[PDB]
Amino acid sequence: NAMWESKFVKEGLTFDDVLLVPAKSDVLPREVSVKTVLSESLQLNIPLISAGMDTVTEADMAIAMARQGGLGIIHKNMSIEQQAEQVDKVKRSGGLLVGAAVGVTADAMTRIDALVKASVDAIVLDTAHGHSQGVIDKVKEVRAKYPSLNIIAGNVATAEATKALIEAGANVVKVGIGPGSICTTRVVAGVGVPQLTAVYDCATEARKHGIPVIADGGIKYSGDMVKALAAGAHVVMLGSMFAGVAESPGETEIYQGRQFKVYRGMGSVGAMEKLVPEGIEGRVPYKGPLADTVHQLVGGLRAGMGYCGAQDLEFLRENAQFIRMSGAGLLESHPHHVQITKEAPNYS
Amino acid sequence: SNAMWESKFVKEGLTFDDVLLVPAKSDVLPREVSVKTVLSESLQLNIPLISAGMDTVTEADMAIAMARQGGLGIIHKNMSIEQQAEQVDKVKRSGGLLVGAAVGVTADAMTRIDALVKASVDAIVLDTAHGHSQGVIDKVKEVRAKYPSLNIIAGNVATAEATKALIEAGANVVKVGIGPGSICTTRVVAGVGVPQLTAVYDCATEARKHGIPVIADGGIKYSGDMVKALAAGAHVVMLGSMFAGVAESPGETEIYQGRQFKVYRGMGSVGAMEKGSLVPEGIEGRVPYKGPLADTVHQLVGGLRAGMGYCGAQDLEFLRENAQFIRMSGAGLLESHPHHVQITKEAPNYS
Amino acid sequence: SNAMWESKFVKEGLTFDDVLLVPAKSDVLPREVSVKTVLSESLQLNIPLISAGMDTVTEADMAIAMARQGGLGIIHKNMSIEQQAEQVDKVKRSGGLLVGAAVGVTADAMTRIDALVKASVDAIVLDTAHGHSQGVIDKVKEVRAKYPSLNIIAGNVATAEATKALIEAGANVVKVGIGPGSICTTRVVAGVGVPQLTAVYDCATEARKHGIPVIADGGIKYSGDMVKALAAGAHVVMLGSMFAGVAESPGETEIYQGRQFKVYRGMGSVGAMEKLVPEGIEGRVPYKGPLADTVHQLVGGLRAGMGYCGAQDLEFLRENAQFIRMSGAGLLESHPHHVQITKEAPNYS
Amino acid sequence: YFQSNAMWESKFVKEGLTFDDVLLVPAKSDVLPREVSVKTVLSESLQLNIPLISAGMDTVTEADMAIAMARQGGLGIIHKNMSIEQQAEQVDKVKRSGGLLVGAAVGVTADAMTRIDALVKASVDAIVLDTAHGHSQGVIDKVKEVRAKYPSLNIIAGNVATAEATKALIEAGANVVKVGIGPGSICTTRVVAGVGVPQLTAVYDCATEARKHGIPVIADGGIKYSGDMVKALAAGAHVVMLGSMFAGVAESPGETEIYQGRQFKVYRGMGSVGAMEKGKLVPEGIEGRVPYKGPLADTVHQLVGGLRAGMGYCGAQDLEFLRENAQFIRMSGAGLLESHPHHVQITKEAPNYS
Ligand SMILES: C/C(=N\O)c1cccc(C(C)(C)NC(=O)Nc2ccc(Br)cc2)c1
């Protein structure tokens, strides 16, 4: 009866539940290191990865990304020959880093070969439920065939799942079940773990095997990134904040005089039609080139590490302290009792 | 004698939107999982869904469509004894379909049950505002005495003491939910309730000890809430709202707010009481038209299969016994719905 | 010491919307329950409702209507002494009806009270912002010393210590509520309050020990809040907002965007007061028609409340009802949701 | 159990509270509001007759605000978004208007000493060493550098939200510590940088540290109503600093624009794009507008009125009593809802509400 009595024990935290407490600082925002190492083959100058979705990352996005010091993951919602071409395309553009997503399917190894042939630096085996036997067995197969290949497996939300995938041979683990802006998983399936807690629990375990974790989803301001990083993540992955960018796939859609870009979940009827969906379709404001959005994110990270007296991303993960707050805390934490006049480059 | 007074405020209650089901090790796919449940020795559903015995939800056409999706429908009692019998008769003739009927706690109650059973009703539901009553308990005994083979679903209850009381009265199944209803105002007019997830849980806890199943009834807005109700301990769930905008439900379509809509109302609302015949405990409204019951039920189950997939649950018994929740704040709720993106299309299972 | 410093944030407060009443075994139906209540040997009420002693809620006509429904009106003090004395007189010579009058702590308090006792007032209500004031305590004492029989309702307090203090000065009834009122801005303008549910309970905890009934005053937006207040230990509740749109309330009906409305305002707002800054605002509520249709919906909900708790009477309810606590999500589930509302119900707007 | 894993497993332990979370608990009172004392001592040479400082923002304080505040018994901080000689002129302008107290902000920069020199020459009564992060090595280094050169100068340093941080500035020479990272109405620090401590707790944790040394603290940011000020003082602050409640009064800088029939003034953060441009950047504030409130004397009379009310509610005769004794009760979001006007359509403006 022990499981029957534990159903409602666990409590979970999300980004907007917390604040990073300022700490003794000696280091200024321009001075801090934002470098990060996923592995031997995989080093990033900025801890950003653009999501593997048909409205977020194709060749042009992955390249603009890699030249910012970050990383692109080509979505798998295309042919095999096509993804391999675009992966090779990013590689011929200055010999820089590139990712490709593969689903746990029958044609998975066929896709992976063609991808390793095009010289991917990391494949991402993405699935709804990374804590699954099929997902384990696949990572085992792939680890067997390509012992040299960076393997990103997700998604997971628990310690148990983080361990299952590490042991199967995945060297980077991906955290997030249901925090995405376009995600309906928690609504339609009732399943999830608040992202902060899920980064924190998966990192605690992953820390032991010296394995890094990517916070995926739920990030809507630069300060969310800081929180996710400080809660244990090595790197964050973004969808919505990148979808509005000129280099992202999909052509600009006009709306109320303004310019927008389509942004849909890979699990939406829209993405799949090209069945019970776990995602929706919509649009985000046109934002400009990747370059200014990148600027605002990193600068936020830079100011947070400054506040936290963290010289590198390591010191931040291992030293940053949070403070929990109520919903009224959240109200104070955003602008309040003033009517906004101008748009800020980092706020709505 | 101070114990009762010092304890007025010790209990805490959780609901659907306070929690999330935690993903567990899975070796099963949504399609591989089984959603069948056994409610008793004569009542078995292929999907854990029951359409509410309300006058804007279930009549003969609703029950027939329900039974065909693998579920069940409860024919409401806002009609004549005779007419309700015909409706049960009608459902029965269309392929040996299952069907339930609602009966109130009155003096006409035995007379009404006599007809529904001669009509071959597969279960009766004694629905009341306060299922923890002598009036209810004595009526459940009275029926169980007369009809010892009859599937009795009794309610509504929100407590373990109450669930135990109706089981020892002879109830096969216990219906859980005081005040959780979408059209319901009980908690506002009378102050009384238990948050649904906790009510299902405390009750499932008692019903288990005796081998009795509970029915989660009310407060389900999306399919994820169904998984939560089942995972909390309910064998089966009862939906009003999610079903009222279906083609097979009674009533006609009307255009409102620029599209098609159906009338949805509470049985304790001023409207519904006029037809049937105290201070009202429900309101009258309308919900969007959704077309055939089939497409709705396909999303319902589809979400259920997805959840159980995430929970490594090959069947509903596993999900009841094993699923773990994690409590979350209001901010957790916001992360759990689509956010910070403008939606351009009604998704089949969202808004 | 350093005790006061470290305990600044220890306490926790709950309000009507924090909580639900748990359904209990019930032998009884709504129509069979008793809603009578006894404030004191002199004052007994057929229904647990007093109307607020404000200049836009209760004058003679309200007080008379209340009494006739089995409740009680408090005639506010925003008039002259001769005006309030004849207001009482009118209510009394209108069938031998119970009536109450407001008095504040000040110089001519005794003269007004003198005039009120002469006119046969049943209960004097010592309305002040801070019942736990030294000046309030001194005044309750003087009135008790002069009128050993007279019912004294003294308010307002939010703490067990204040309640204890009023009871010892001679108060027969204590009125509980700092800040929860619909028209009130005390909490906002002065940072000061206690959540009404915790307040009623805390004071009831102290008052029960001396057998003194408390009034849960302000904060009631629906029928169930009243069930909650009584179940938290109040003997009776006092309403202003729920009663302000009633036909027998002072104030003529005003037209605004076509719909009938009535003026409703705090007694500490600018208009009512005409040295200190306002602690109230001035507003408007829809017309509701006769008091009786409003009372019937109120008692109706109370009765359904009592039937769900298995309470034959209000003493059972006070001593036995159990609450359960919930988050914001639970309150969202507690109100009707995910449905367009078509028409108004007579008890939910 | 190790040294390495201490910080890791304390990450989520702390709890923060803010104004909207709590309520002051009424206590026995023998004192009427008009009898209480709102006088407050920040240091031997800096006594305020009312507990209110006009924040040092370009949309808030300049000579006219500073003058008007002082004549009410408060203080104004001339902002630094202007030249050195200009800022000293503003100071002299206030000092040559009846020897009114004035303070003036200075950041941590090479010219800081040049500026400080110029302000002291103008008889400034306090320098506010104002920075985004009070707990920075530079800020401590500056306080020390200034204290050394000006042993009698009043040095108000900010901004911090922790006892650890508050101890550093005190040990470095600040007479008065300013509290608040993120609570500001025009602030986005918490959104863009993720960082902050809820202001009520922040005021409390710092006051706890500071009172051991006999040092006052300033609640800076987050006050929307007079009641919030009272919570802030009762949480341990000697005095509050206000932006948005002062931003839209006659004496504040800015023209009177009008939209939809009503009067407004611009109010922007100092970390906003607008404020920076005056002297790509990654802002930590936003620009907007607030209602025109009219002459300062009205906002101030309402403010001090709320305070006296709450002190009477708390049986406080002076602010020291309130700091030492005031108790809070914690509430939820249904309580905050009950704590505002509800279920009535408000038909006119209370001078102190909305
Ligand atoms: C990213 C994502 N979910 O998080 C996604 C992507 C495409 C399709 C889908 C669909 C087909 C809608 N959902 C699933 O495949 N859900 C699912 C759920 C549980 C298990 Br086990 C296996 C799959 C989901």
Ligand SMILES: C/C(=N\O)c1cccc(C(C)(C)NC(=O)Nc2ccc(Br)cc2)c1
């Ligand atoms: C509450 C409810 N369903 O949950 C319902 C349904 C129809 C009519 C009613 C009416 C008759 C308006 N209300 C009640 O019967 N309320 C009620 C409440 C407690 C007790 Br005991 C007996 C009756 C209620």
Ligand SMILES: C/C(=N\O)c1cccc(C(C)(C)NC(=O)Nc2ccc(Br)cc2)c1
């Ligand atoms: C809050 C309230 N009734 O509940 C009320 C009523 C009338 C006037 C007032 C006024 C005079 C505006 N406020 C106060 O008198 N506040 C107050 C505060 C503390 C003390 Br001690 C004495 C009075 C308040």
Ligand SMILES: C/C(=N\O)c1cccc(C(C)(C)NC(=O)Nc2ccc(Br)cc2)c1
């Ligand atoms: C936050 C604030 N005042 O409270 C303010 C004002 C002006 C400029 C700024 C800018 C330049 C945008 N931000 C910073 O200076 N941020 C910052 C953050 C951390 C550290 Br360490 C040093 C500086 C901030």
Ligand SMILES: O=c1[nH]cnc2c1ncn2[C@@H]1O[C@H](COP(=O)(O)O)[C@@H](O)[C@H]1O
């Ligand atoms: O349709 C889907 N359903 C659920 N999750 C999705 C879907 N499509 C993408 N995601 C996840 O959502 C992430 C982006 O979340 P966002 O940055 O919060 O917009 C992606 O990286 C995926 O992990």
Ligand SMILES: O=c1[nH]cnc2c1ncn2[C@@H]1O[C@H](COP(=O)(O)O)[C@@H](O)[C@H]1O
């Ligand atoms: O008017 C009434 N008052 C309170 N609850 C009601 C009333 N009518 C029906 N219900 C309950 O609400 C359930 C439907 O809830 P829904 O699925 O949220 O629409 C029904 O199955 C009944 O249990």
Ligand SMILES: O=c1[nH]cnc2c1ncn2[C@@H]1O[C@H](COP(=O)(O)O)[C@@H](O)[C@H]1O
């Ligand atoms: O203006 C005032 N400021 C604060 N509270 C008031 C004021 N005037 C009346 N009250 C209280 O508010 C109660 C009515 O609150 P309501 O029933 O929620 O409308 C009255 O009975 C008084 O106790």
Ligand SMILES: O=c1[nH]cnc2c1ncn2[C@@H]1O[C@H](COP(=O)(O)O)[C@@H](O)[C@H]1O
């Ligand atoms: O640009 C900004 N970003 C963050 N905080 C600011 C900024 N400008 C001023 N502040 C702070 O916010 C306070 C004013 O907050 P308010 O009274 O809530 O408007 C000031 O006294 C500063 O401490």
